[PDB]
Amino acid sequence: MVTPVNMSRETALRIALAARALPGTTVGQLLEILHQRIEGPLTEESLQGVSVTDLKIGLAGSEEDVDMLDTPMSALKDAVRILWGEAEVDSLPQPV
């Protein structure tokens, strides 16, 4: 055995790069928000089940004090992306 969390590590290596998109928020600090005692494998679809507002409030716990949280309102958009599995940029700025 080995307890495989995902089929590809790239799905892994990326979920931890996001941690950077955040000031002092750790990797396992923005994911744990999903709660759910049981662990289970964190697939690409699993992550796509929450909203941005859930992330920032997940660290502080309440959207009431998040204001004091070093985490801004643009870091989530940054991170929430990397785990979404769309980390890659879309089309070009201007409309093609």
Instruction: Round to whole Å and give the CA distance between 5 and 38.
Output: 13
CATH 1.10.390.10 at 1-96, yes or no: no
Q: Measure the CA–CA gap between 82 and 5, rounded to whole angstroms.
A: 17
Residues whose CB is less than 8 angstroms from the CB of residue 71 and which lie 6 or more positions away in sequence, other chains included: 22, 23, 25, 56, 59, 60
DSSP secondary structure of 24-89 = S--HHHHHGGG--SS-----HHHHTTS-HHHHHHHHHSSTTTGGGSS--SSHHHHHHHHHHT--S-
Asked if residue 18 lies in contact with residue 6, where contact means CB atoms within 8 angstroms, the answer is no
Experimental method: NMR
Give the DSSP letter of residue 12. H
Q: How many CB atoms lie within 10 A of CB 55?
A: 23
Q: Which residues of 71-84 are buried (b: 16+ CB within 10 A; e: fewer)?
A: beeebbeebbbbbe
Locate the domains of the chain by residue range. Answer: 1-96
Q: Which two tokens stand for residue 40?
A: 């289970």
Helix (H, G, I), strand (E, B) or coil at 13: helix
CA angle 81/50/14 to nearest 5° reads 35
Helix (H) or strand (E) holding 14: helix 10-15
Residue 96 is encoded by which pair of tokens?
């093609």
Residue 32 structure tokens: 């744990």
